[PDB]
Design a protein around this ligand. Structure first.
Ligand code: ZN
Lengths: 24, 210, 132, 139, 98, 81, 129, 81, 213
RNA sequence: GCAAGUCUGGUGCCAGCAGCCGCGGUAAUUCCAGCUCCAAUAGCGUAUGCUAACGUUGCUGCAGUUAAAAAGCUCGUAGUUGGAUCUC
RNA sequence: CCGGAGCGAAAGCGUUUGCCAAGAACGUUUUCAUUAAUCAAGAACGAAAGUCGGAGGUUCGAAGACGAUCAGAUACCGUCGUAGUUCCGACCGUAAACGAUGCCGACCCGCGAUCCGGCGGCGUUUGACCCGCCGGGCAGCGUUGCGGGAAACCACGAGUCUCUGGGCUCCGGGGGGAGUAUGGUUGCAAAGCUGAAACUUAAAGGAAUUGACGGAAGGGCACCACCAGGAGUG
């Protein structure tokens, strides 16, 4: 299912934003 | 035939009006429009008898242009003209396929029945589509008693007539057999032909006993 | 399981087209013809062939079989195919010709004929079948 | 469709200019990337010091220990893996010596059943490895 | 590959049609894609119509019928044997089965 | 239909086809001089009248507005040609 | 919406010729189209065409003789000199034996052999063979 | 096709369809060459003369073979106009 | 040789003079003995490729070899034939039969000046088979055949000494490559050129000229 | 592929060969050697850049239904291209 | 009722009646008189889910509880039910938003239907129906073996393409990495738009065909199937 590769990708990008936000 | 000797006579017009050769059904082919005079009120397309007579003379010129009569072939897979092509072949000397046309008689050379004619005359283009399409792999001109709703996919001499009625199709085979013999010298064109036009008419088993 | 195989079907037909007057409607007389004419290393096979010939002979005398034909019965139908009425069905006393077909004759030279009855066209155009 | 207009020389030129970038062989040769990441830096050969002698296993469906060497370049200090081409020439390789490595067939691409080795050693100790394999230049 | 020219529905000249519900599974099926089946059967079976006929207090009473409009999805119209999988050339026959 | 003559078409085919797809365009409408019993003068009116047409003096109505040609009332003449 | 009248003219001739027609109707007419047909008619590729003189763009009915293989236009009308005319001959004509390239020199519409004899180039309209 | 000296170099000159001027190829098996016999003016018997027409397979396949022979016969006055 | 068709009977009794008489009327050559009767002296074949195709059955893979044979007299005539038979030798001989039945005349033209015998194609012709299309461009007298080894054998056996080929598509498919080249060669005598605009004078067909025989 | 050996012996998924597909798991035409043979040739291989091959950058000259692909749809300037009609 | 029928640029749109201002097509010897087509930058609209602020919350129902099944179900099945689904405003601008097929224009087959308008013709019926025709609209069938294509299939062309050039916009360059990183930018957020590289890989994929298989369908067959029983085993 290619849609859940997009579901896990949006879930990984959302975690990378929180890691990058705490380094401000 | 543009001459005055080959013009159709009164005896020919009466036979056409009696046999019903001027009725082409409710449908019309776009390539058969030039041979239709006018559509009547009940959807029937009236076939122009003058165009029928001209194509009949034109087809006879192609038959007599074949020296050997055996090189001319007549095929009728429909029962409406099975005996019409038998009497036609006996009157002119041609070959005939009166029964069921076996696919391969024109292309399969090692086959038993491998009659390869020079001119094919088809009763109904739609009912005898197999001899027509098979006459395309070999250079064989094809004449056909074409109705107003008949496909002309491989018909080079389309005779506009009613190939649906038994008396209608039987007359066209008698008219063609008469005109072919007239152009050869068998009939003097003065006295009427001894062969009656009803000899080519098909008889259904309910009236064969009568 | 009374169905014959191609060995019996073909042999029983080629023996009739070559020998028709020989075989009659009796299986026992037909059985003896196959002994002298054909060469078969089996006796049960000869009875199947001669037995099927007897079945074909009843059909031949009844009419033309769809496989082959004979020359004694074909002449009966050929003369029957040469049948012609004393008066032809075309040359009738009066021919009914519609108005539109009459104008076509008026365009040609044969516009004034004696045995032409101008039939009135049928009013209304209901020549098409209802759809659905 | 393509614009054929007589005054479309600019439209046609700019379009082909930006579409050539979508070509892999063109974009790798006309950008900073694929040149700085290349250990040779656009060179055909390179010298290096033999650091280790590692035997990499070939890929399926093959089974053979490909004899290579972990070599550190002298020109830029990068560490690569040069493949010992011939048979038994790994024994001819000395430890901590100069070797002239070159490309391995396909440009920047692993050749054969070797997983990721894309370099091969040409000379060893300022002499050709081919001579060491054919009983010449005894060193 | 495109299996049907009409994509298995009757949407020509439109972009969206009203979806309806199935019967034996209750699935949202488009109106043009639904497998229509107008079932018209008697209220009483033919095997039991004679018992109701003799028990009728009247002389001649025609038993009414059950006019039911059924909708089937593709996955259920085949399981319920309403429609079958036809040959490649047989699928083009839009004529209802006799 | 391969050798169909295009420069000399039959007058029936020209009259049947569209008013623009002919060899030379020609209007399909016409003018008529409606002669009602009220006004004795000849008053030309377009076929697709599209409006309530009245003769000189305003005696009676001539044409009711329709989609195509005008629906003439009882007692109207023709093109008179 | 047209952008060219000579393109739709030669496209109608090319299609009707391949469909076996004997005459083709060209909806728009122009002096460039008429002089284009004259170059083909002078070399024996079309018959005697009749210009329907209407008070509009005008129509032309061309008599097709079947001798034509294909007639097309070269859009846009590139400026062809005499030194590069040999290049267009190898890209548009079937062979050096037949086929002509219709150029628009300063002396009027003509083929490529007439332009070489007159020693003058111009804008290219199309070709026919 | 000559060789600038009057020598024809083609090994055979193919036929052209009398209906569409198309060259009848060597494997155009759907093509025909029909002969339309000539008759005498006073009697109407076959006098050994005939008008030969060739039709390519493409025109014959589409159904334009009967209309072509009909028009080609009017050109030679074989059939009435 | 016992002829089974009326065309083979005429050429057996020396009624048809040259093989070009059959091409003039487009008669189907159904007997391979007709081909070796006229051009049997100088006719060199060549097996282009034996491509074994397999039919997956329950027993595994049923191998059946195809044979692409090119036949040409090296002047004006070339033929291509395919045959899929169980045995390799049977497929080759069967393809030689079909390569003769499919032989066709190829027209040869001139590049620029017409001096001597024709050497190249008359014009640019294109043949198509599947996806691969080839184009034969006329070339000078001393350029030779500029093509791949596959279409070169067809152009040499067709008598074409010089040709410029522009082959596109999946030319790796030798089957469609040869049939596309053979289809372009067949279009040389179907291309209407100004040197063929002369009104053709019809003659008697061999079926009509020898109808009594 | 691509012109030239099911040649000889051992090495046996090991060592290796191989640009690609692929060759070795005890009769390897591939490898480890001889003979012989082959485009060769005073030159010949290898690595990398680049050109043709490549109509796989398509102006000539490619593609965008299903193989990579027409913006969800329409408006809209610049840009691009624009109906017929003036001494032949 | 409701259809392979209409309308709209699309998304989309069907209970009655009323109100409101649009739109194609057709009609036209009206009017205007080339005022065009396609369109970077820019903009309206854009199913559903989601988001913020109110109302209302029937049913359904993310989540969630519980009941069943399984070796294990955090599911399908069942009960129940939050958000949501409904309405109001501001956002979000994403769909297999598909005809997986840009717009405009010419040319290029046939037939029978269908939709709107116009036109002219026997009749029936106080517009309805009948037979045609011209113009666009959704489509269909037949031939594509007049072409196109790898083929499936294509006349809402996917035809007029090596015989290559009607105009214009967007967009693709082996499969992965990856619609990821980074930068800019929009947004309340979720995220949208723009968009890489290193590296890895000899295939990935399209169409079609023959086998095998299906827990797919249909048909047919045998007391190693049953029916009817009869023996015997357990
Ligand atoms: Zn459902």
């Amino acid at each position: 299912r290619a849609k859940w590769r997009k579901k896990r990708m949006r879930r990984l990008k959302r975690k990378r934003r929180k890691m990058r936000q705490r380094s401000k | 035939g543009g001459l005055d000797v080959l013009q159709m006579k009164e005896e020919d017009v009466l036979k056409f009006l009696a046999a019903g050769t001027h009725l082409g059904g409710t449908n019309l082919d776009f390539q058969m429009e030039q041979y239709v005079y006018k559509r009547k009120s009940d959807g029937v397309y009236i076939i122009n008898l003058k165009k029928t007579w001209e194509k009949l003379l034109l087809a006879a010129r192609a038959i007599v242009a074949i020296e050997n009569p055996a090189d001319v072939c007549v095929i009728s897979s429909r029962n409406t003209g099975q005996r019409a092509v038998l009497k036609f072949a006996s009157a002119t000397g041609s070959t005939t396929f009166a029964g069921r046309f076996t696919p391969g008689t024109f292309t399969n050379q090692i086959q038993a029945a491998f009659r390869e004619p020079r001119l094919l005359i088809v009763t109904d283009p739609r009912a005898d589509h197999q001899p027509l399409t098979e006459a395309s792999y070999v250079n064989i001109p094809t004449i056909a008693l074409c109705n107003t709703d008949s496909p002309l996919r491989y018909v080079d001499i389309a005779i506009p007539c009613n190939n649906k009625g038994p008396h209608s199709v039987g007359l066209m085979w008698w008219m063609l057999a008469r005109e072919v013999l007239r152009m050869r010298g068998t009939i003097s064109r003065e006295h009427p032909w001894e062969v009656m036009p009803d000899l080519y008419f098909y008889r259904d088993p309910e009236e064969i006993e009568k | 399981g009374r169905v014959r195989t191609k060995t019996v079907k073909k042999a029983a037909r080629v023996i009739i087209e070559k020998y028709y007057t020989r075989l009659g409607n009796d299986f026992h007389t037909n059985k003896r013809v196959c002994e002298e004419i054909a060469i078969i290393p089996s006796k049960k096979l000869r009875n199947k062939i001669a037995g099927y010939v007897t079945h074909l002979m009843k059909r031949i005398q009844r009419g033309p079989v769809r496989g082959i034909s004979i020359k004694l019965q074909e002449e009966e139908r050929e003369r029957r195919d040469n049948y012609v009425p004393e008066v032809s069905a075309l040359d009738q006393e009066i021919i009914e010709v519609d108005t539109d077909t009459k104008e076509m004759l008026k365009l040609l030279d044969f516009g004034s004929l004696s045995n032409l009855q101008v039939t009135q066209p049928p009013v209304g155009m209901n020549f098409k079948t209802p759809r659905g | 469709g393509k614009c054929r207009g007589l005054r479309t020389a600019r439209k046609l030129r700019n379009h082909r200019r930006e579409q050539k970038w979508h070509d892999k062989q063109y974009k790798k040769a006309h950008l900073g990337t694929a040149l700085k990441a290349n250990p040779f830096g656009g060179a055909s050969h390179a010298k290096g010091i033999v650091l280790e002698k590692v035997g990499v296993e070939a890929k399926q469906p093959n089974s053979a220990i490909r004899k290579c060497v972990r070599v550190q370049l002298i020109k830029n200090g990068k560490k690569i893996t040069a493949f010992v081409p011939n048979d038994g020439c790994l024994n001819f390789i000395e430890e901590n010596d100069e070797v002239l490595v070159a490309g391995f067939g396909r440009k920047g691409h692993a050749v054969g059943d070797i997983p990721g080795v894309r370099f091969k050693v040409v000379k060893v100790a300022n002499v050709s490895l081919l001579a060491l394999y054919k009983g010449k230049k005894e060193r | 590959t495109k299996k049907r020219r009409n994509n298995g529905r009757a949407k020509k000249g439109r972009g969206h049609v009203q979806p309806i519900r199935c019967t034996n599974c209750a699935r949202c099926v488009p109106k043009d894609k639904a497998i229509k089946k107008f079932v018209i059967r008697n209220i009483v079976e033919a095997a039991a119509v004679r018992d109701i006929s003799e028990a009728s207090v009247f002389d001649s009473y025609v038993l009414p019928k059950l006019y039911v409009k059924l909708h089937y999805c593709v996955s259920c119209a085949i399981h319920s044997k309403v429609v079958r999988n036809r040959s490649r050339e047989a699928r083009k026959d839009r004529t209802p089965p006799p | 239909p391969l050798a169909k003559d295009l420069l000399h078409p039959t007058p029936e085919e020209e009259r049947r086809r569209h008013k623009k797809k002919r060899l030379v365009q020609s209007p399909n409408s016409y003018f008529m001089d409606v002669k009602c019993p009220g006004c004795y003068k000849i008053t030309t009116v377009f076929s697709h009248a599209q409006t309530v047409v009245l003769c000189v003096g305003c005696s009676t109505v001539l044409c009711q507005p329709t989609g195509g040609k005008a629906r003439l009332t009882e007692g109207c003449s023709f093109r008179r040609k | 919406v047209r952008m060219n009248v000579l393109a739709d003219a030669l496209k109608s001739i090319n299609n009707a010729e391949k469909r076996g027609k004997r005459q083709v109707l060209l909806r728009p007419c122009s002096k460039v189209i008429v002089r284009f047909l004259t170059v083909m008619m002078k070399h024996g590729y079309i018959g005697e065409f009749e210009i329907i003189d209407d008070h509009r763009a005008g129509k032309i009915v061309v008599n097709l003789t079947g001798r034509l293989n294909k007639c097309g236009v070269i859009s846009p009308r590139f400026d062809v000199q005499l030194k590069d005319l040999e290049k267009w001959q190898n890209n548009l004509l079937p062979s050096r034996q037949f086929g002509f390239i219709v150029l628009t020199t300063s002396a009027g519409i003509m083929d490529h052999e007439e332009a070489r004899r007159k020693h003058t180039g111009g804008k290219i309209l199309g070709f026919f063979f | 096709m000559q060789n600038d000296a009057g020598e024809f170099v083609d090994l055979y000159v193919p036929r052209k369809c009398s209906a569409s001027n198309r060259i009848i190829g060597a494997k155009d098996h759907a093509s025909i060459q029909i002969n339309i016999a000539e008759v005498d003016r006073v009697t109407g018997r076959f006098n050994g003369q005939f008008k030969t027409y060739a039709i390519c397979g493409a025109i014959r396949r589409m159904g334009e073979a009967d209309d072509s022979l009909l028009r080609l016969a009017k050109t030679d006055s074989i059939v009435a106009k | 040789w016992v002829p089974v068709t009326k065309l083979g009977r005429l050429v057996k009794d020396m009624k048809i003079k040259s093989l070009e008489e059959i091409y003039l009327y487009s008669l189907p050559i159904k007997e391979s003995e007709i081909i070796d009767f006229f051009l049997g002296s100088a006719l060199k074949d060549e097996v282009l490729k034996i491509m074994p195709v397999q039919k997956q059955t329950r027993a595994g893979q049923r191998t059946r070899f195809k044979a692409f044979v090119a036949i040409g007299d090296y002047n004006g005539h070339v033929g291509l034939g395919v045959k899929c038979s169980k045995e390799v030798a049977t497929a080759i001989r069967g393809a030689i039969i079909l390569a003769k039945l499919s032989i066709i005349p190829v027209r040869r033209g001139y590049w620029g000046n017409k001096i001597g015998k024709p050497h190249t194609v008359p014009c640019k012709v294109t043949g198509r088979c599947g996806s691969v299309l080839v184009r034969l461009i006329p070339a000078p007298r001393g350029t030779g055949i500029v093509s791949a080894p596959v279409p070169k054998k067809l152009l040499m056996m067709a008598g074409i000494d010089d040709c410029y080929t522009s082959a596109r598509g999946c030319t790796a498919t030798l089957g469609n490559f040869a049939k596309a080249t053979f289809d372009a060669i067949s279009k040389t005598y179907s291309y209407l050129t100004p040197d063929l605009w002369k009104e053709t004078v019809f003659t008697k067909s061999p079926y009509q000229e020898f109808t009594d025989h």
